[PDB]
Design a protein around this ligand. Structure first.
Ligand SMILES: Cc1cc2nc3c(=O)[nH]c(=O)nc-3n(C[C@H](O)[C@H](O)[C@H](O)COP(=O)(O)OP(=O)(O)OC[C@H]3O[C@@H](n4cnc5c(N)ncnc54)[C@H](O)[C@@H]3O)c2cc1C
Ligand SMILES: Cc1cc2nc3c(=O)[nH]c(=O)nc-3n(C[C@H](O)[C@H](O)[C@H](O)COP(=O)(O)OP(=O)(O)OC[C@H]3O[C@@H](n4cnc5c(N)ncnc54)[C@H](O)[C@@H]3O)c2cc1C
Ligand SMILES: COC(=O)Nc1ccc2[nH]c(I)c(CCNC(C)=O)c2c1
Ligand SMILES: COC(=O)Nc1ccc2[nH]c(I)c(CCNC(C)=O)c2c1
Ligand SMILES: [Zn+2]
Ligand SMILES: [Zn+2]
Lengths: 227, 228
């Protein structure tokens, strides 16, 4: 069987993102998959990287270095429990789906904080395991993104440039760097202005796509693919 | 005389970022510029875009849409005051410098939340009224980024790819979109690896650049500049 984690970052259960997350839960559950959702806003997930992320006393209360203190805290099982809970769900997952509206060509800050705080050194990567050989090798990852801007605006010679340009920090700089094989993003362009039927069509396409998700080939996560 | 806002996102005043921020304050201050710093971590700045950011009646209370609601609250002056306090600093600023460690090929979340919450519709852009028509037209912006990776790693054929690839969402998708003229980024590679002399050299190079900052032209903030 397979374990799926959906990390979901939208304020509103009735939203289009809400529906995409619920269709993913229904379909993967139907297939017999083990499903877990991290609903960041409902958890009121803490996005800031602070000394509060380390329980007990710090490895150097003089000069606070977040990257080093969390690395040492991981190794010695001394991270705050919101972080260690997320890492447990990630560790056990076979597929991690991120479900979010595009904010400023990127993830909402709440989801940026999950990545900043949960994918720490020792857990997600280390000197030996950057990129291919990142500590999360074996796992699949998939961005399901909704946009304000239409698909035409997101072309090579449109104002916004190509969709693949903004994916680079997330797919390559984050997911690939951690060891993830990355599946082709799912992008539901401009739902707010699509018809009720185009909306239905995008939701169903997602459901339909999750049906064969495990047969999918990972993208080549490379400068060429993105650019 | 000019006004500068530095939006600063580091936890530790004694850090290399802390130093880059202090030399900017000192140098622009010495020039006789008006300088403001938003020290996000010290302010415990709130990064989450929630319905707490609107204090008035919601437009559509049945289904909460963050961007719709904050556009409305902006026009109504019913946005939370931590947001309107930042907007006032930006509105008055001639130049906005962002000072931050690269986190996951991007800004730390606290700073992403600043962008998410402060650069709202009605204030920073409108639909239509973005890119060259963005509402913050006439303002300069500059990213001053520190990295863990070396300059060599951040090349066209390096593992990380070219450093300019990760600037795209920030420079073009955010700053250019709001109407800023974007100045060439200041990238301070791998200070943790660098020697004492090399670090001091990076701090002085920033300081030195700031002397002539008002004489600089913006980058062409285009696909070609970023990707070739
Ligand atoms: C701070 C900020 C930054 C942003 N930056 C960008 C950016 O850089 N680039 C960009 O393109 N956009 C950007 N946006 C816009 C944003 O990405 C879009 O508003 C968002 O992706 C839309 O997704 P949603 O789930 O909130 O849509 P919703 O408004 O919640 O959904 C659209 C409609 O679909 C309906 N719906 C819900 N479920 C279903 C269903 N099952 N079937 C049919 N209809 C359904 C809803 O009721 C609604 O009427 C930004 C927005 C904000 C607030
Ligand atoms: C969550 C997270 C994600 C990250 N993601 C990335 C990434 O995607 N890509 C990447 O490349 N890196 C990444 N990093 C690494 C990160 O960007 C670096 O650790 C950071 O940029 C270094 O900046 P700093 O100010 O903290 O350095 P510091 O550790 O504070 O500086 C290094 C040295 O400089 C010294 N120093 C301070 N001031 C001065 C001065 N006045 N003169 C001389 N020396 C001085 C300090 O004492 C210290 O010894 C990430 C780190 C974290 C924690
Ligand atoms: C413990 O501190 C972090 O969490 N660091 C962190 C996280 C994600 C990262 N991606 C990339 I490239 C780097 C640069 C790696 N540094 C080198 C190459 O010497 C990086 C660093
Ligand atoms: C809902 O209110 C927001 O805050 N929306 C928001 C914010 C930043 C944005 N950048 C980019 I491209 C877009 C797409 C704009 N939509 C168009 C042109 O149809 C965008 C939208
Ligand atoms: Zn890659
Ligand atoms: Zn641009």
């Amino acid at each position: 069987g397979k374990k799926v984690l959906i990390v979901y970052a939208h304020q509103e259960p009735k939203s289009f993102n809400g529906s995409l997350k619920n269709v993913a839960v229904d379909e993967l559950s139907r297939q017999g998959c083990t499903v877990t959702v991290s609903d960041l806003y409902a958890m009121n997930f803490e996005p800031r990287a602070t000394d509060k992320d380390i329980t007990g006393t710090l490895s150097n209360p003089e000069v606070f270095n977040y990257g080093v203190e969390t690395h040492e805290a991981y190794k010695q099982r001394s991270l705050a429990s919101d972080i260690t809970d997320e890492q447990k769900k990630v560790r056990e997952a076979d597929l991690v789906i991120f479900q979010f509206p595009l904010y400023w060509f990127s993830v909402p800050a709440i989801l940026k904080g999950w990545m900043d705080r949960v994918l720490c050194q020792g857990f997600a990567f280390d000197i030996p395991g950057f990129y291919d050989s990142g500590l999360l090798q074996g796992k699949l990852a998939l961005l399901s993104v909704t946009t304000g801007g239409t698909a035409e605006m997101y072309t090579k010679t449109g104002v916004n440039g190509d969709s693949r340009y903004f994916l680079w920090p997330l797919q390559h700089g984050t997911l690939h760097f951690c060891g993830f094989k990355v599946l082709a993003p799912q992008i539901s362009f401009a739902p707010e202005i699509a018809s009720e039927e185009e909306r239905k069509g995008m939701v169903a396409a997602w459901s339909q796509r999750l049906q064969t998700i495990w047969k999918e080939e990972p993208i080549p996560c490379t400068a060429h693919w993105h650019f």
